[PDB]
Design a protein around this ligand. Structure first.
Ligand code: ZN
Length: 627
């Protein structure tokens, strides 16, 4: 009932089969999973057992195949009886297939595997005591996309979702992607995940953590020194966000919405493990300006967590729907011009991602096509997010806007609640929900959106907030050249200029500057180093909103404008600041900025702070400096 030749591409069975799994999930039903784990900070390993409640499905060849990757499976036990297993030879990138003899049991059986993580585990990130400001060891898992198979043996595919129950022992406190149960100290933390989740959403963190309320159904976890700060950051908006998102879709389904603010050495940008959102400390600005980042993880509570991409071929249904709903939450809070601006910055992110991404012709396509050979990680770029946002936004516009599309959002998420789906399954629900709207629904070029690489059709977004940034930014470039005095500059420019700018406008503003403005009529090879008064006059007049900002996002862009402006005095300040942040995205280009202008400082800086970043952060920064 939908357009050829999209139908031509329609898999034979939906949800589409997951090539990234070596497991045979199509043969089993996972009724419930249980993790009994023990954290050893000293061995850098998690050891224990996983217990599945499985039901045999009959609808040809039969066996029990599980995913593992560099994992020590010690014993298996079916219904309490030893069961015969063997581990195949490792196949990049999908790992070793754990084959277990299931012949003996009945339809519904209890599967218990005992295992140890390996030195080669790719599921757990370990930080020593030099790597956290608190001074205690820390560990967190990062499981997306197929790393769960490295934490425990399982059907490592987004199409298999199972309730969870978890007992984790640790010398240090433990948080989990679940709700903690009452216990009755043996250092054993116990949690329940009452909603079915995929294993990539399984999240564990253990370290020196305390907690504080940030809402009626929200608590924040983080290092104690940072505890009251983090609480202040989240406590004003977190419940409001949840309610904004509940109005756009429907009641939040997970009970509590908690946030773990990870250690400073945390190199990533966040994770949406259900019941415990992993957040970056660079979210803590002390003014609540870099806070809308929470709407995204929160949004995942519906799209991705509640309704899952069945495979990493259909990841856009995870992340695209989430950027959409995310921008809808902020749009509801800050006004339509803001979501359009969010959207417009997103369009910018997409093009740099497409211009640059390797094999921009295979991976830039909205619906991916990983067979059993492509690492699912190649499917993760800005495409799913932005081009997926743009397709959902396009669908919104043509259907008569938010009030016409909003009913489709509630049917979709209500229809696939607790299940997985593919692209094709989404479209049918789309076509099925608008009988009347069938004629323009059909006007959509699904083939270019879903299956062509490169930039999708460009949408018309309100450019208001971006115009102001570009205008103000262009003006500085033009004025850099006519005005020769700090007092001259102080009279054409005022703190009111960037007053009503939000965090994202400052970042674009400061970024537009280093691109010598944002206009066709841009001075060619205009350089900010040649105008020492203009550059310094900018950070001077805008000291309160730019220079005095503790928003790491705004702080980095400032350092960039200062490295571009070749303001030699500030380098020590960029050097010092690289000692305060561990986020790969600040630390890395941050060490690149410092090295170009002042090689000797970068090297000294890196020498003093090398062993304080996440080991991966250090390797990559050490690479750029040529060590
Ligand atoms: Zn996301």
């Amino acid at each position: 009932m939908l357009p050829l030749s999209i139908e031509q591409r329609r898999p034979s069975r939906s949800p589409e089969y997951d090539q990234s799994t070596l497991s045979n999930y199509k043969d089993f039903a996972v009724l419930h999973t249980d993790l009994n784990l023990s954290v050893s900070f000293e061995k850098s390993a998690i050891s224990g057992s996983v217990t599945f409640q499985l039901k045999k499905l009959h609808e040809k060849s039969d066996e029990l195949h599980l995913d593992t990757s560099y994992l020590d499976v010690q014993e298996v036990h079916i219904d309490g009886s030893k069961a015969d297993f063997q581990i195949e030879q490792r196949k990049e990138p999908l790992g070793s297939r754990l084959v277990i003899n299931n012949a003996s049991c009945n339809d519904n059986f209890t599967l218990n595997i005992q295992f140890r993580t390996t030195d080669k585990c790719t599921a757990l990130q370990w930080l020593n005591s030099k790597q956290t400001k608190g001074g205690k060891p820390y560990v967190f898992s990062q499981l997306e996309a197929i790393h769960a198979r490295s934490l425990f043996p399982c059907f490592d595919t987004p199409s298999v979702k199972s309730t969870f129950t978890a007992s984790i022992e640790s010398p240090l406190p433990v948080v989990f992607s679940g709700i903690r149960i009452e216990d009755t100290d043996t250092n054993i933390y116990r949690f329940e995940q009452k909603v079915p989740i995929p294993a990539y959403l399984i999240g564990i963190a253990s370290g020196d953590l305390s907690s504080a309320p940030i809402g009626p159904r929200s608590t924040v976890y983080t290092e104690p020194f940072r505890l009251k700060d983090c609480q202040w950051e989240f406590e004003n908006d977190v419940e409001k966000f949840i309610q904004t998102a509940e109005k756009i879709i429907f009641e939040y389904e997970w009970g509590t919405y908690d946030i773990l603010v990870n250690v400073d050495s945390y190199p990533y940008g966040g994770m949406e493990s259900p019941n415990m959102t992993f957040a970056t400390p660079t979210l803590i600005a002390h003014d609540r300006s870099n806070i809308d980042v929470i709407a995204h993880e929160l949004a995942h509570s519906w799209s991705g967590n509640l309704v899952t991409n069945c495979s990493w071929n259909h990841f856009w249904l995870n992340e695209g729907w989430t950027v959409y709903l995310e921008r809808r939450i902020i749009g509801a809070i800050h006004g339509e011009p803001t979501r359009h601006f969010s959207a417009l910055i997103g369009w910018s992110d997409l093009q740099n991602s497409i211009d640059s991404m390797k094999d921009p012709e295979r991976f830039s396509t909205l619906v991916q096509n990983l067979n059993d050979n492509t690492d699912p990680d190649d499917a993760f770029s800005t495409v799913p997010y932005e081009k997926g946002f743009n397709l959902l936004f396009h669908l919104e516009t043509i259907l008569g806007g938010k009030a016409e599309f909003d009913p489709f959002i509630r049917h979709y998420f209500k229809k696939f609640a607790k299940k997985s789906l593919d692209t094709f399954q989404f479209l049918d629900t789309l076509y099925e929900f608008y009988p009347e709207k069938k004629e323009i629904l059909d006007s959509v070029d699904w083939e270019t959106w879903l299956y062509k690489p490169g930039m999708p059709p460009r949408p018309h977004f309100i450019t208001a907030l971006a115009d102001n940034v570009y205008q103000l930014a262009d003006k500085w470039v033009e004025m850099a050249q006519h005005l020769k005095t700090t007092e001259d500059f102080r009279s054409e420019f005022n703190a009111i200029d960037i007053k009503d700018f939000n965090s994202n406008q400052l970042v674009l503003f400061l970024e537009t500057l280093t691109q010598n403005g944002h206009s066709n009529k841009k001075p060619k090879d205009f350089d900010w180093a040649k105008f020492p008064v203009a550059s310094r006059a900018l950070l001077d007049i805008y000291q309160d909103n730019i220079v005095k900002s503790q928003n790491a996002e705004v702080v980095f862009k400032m350092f960039k404008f200062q490295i571009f402006a070749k303001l030699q005095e500030e380098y020590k300040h960029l050097a010092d600041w690289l000692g305060t942040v561990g986020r790969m995205k600040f630390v890395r280009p941050g060490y690149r900025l410092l090295n170009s202008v002042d090689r000797r400082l970068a090297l000294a800086t890196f020498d003093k702070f090398k062993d304080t970043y996440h080991p991966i952060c250090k390797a990559l920064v050490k690479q750029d400096l040529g060590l």
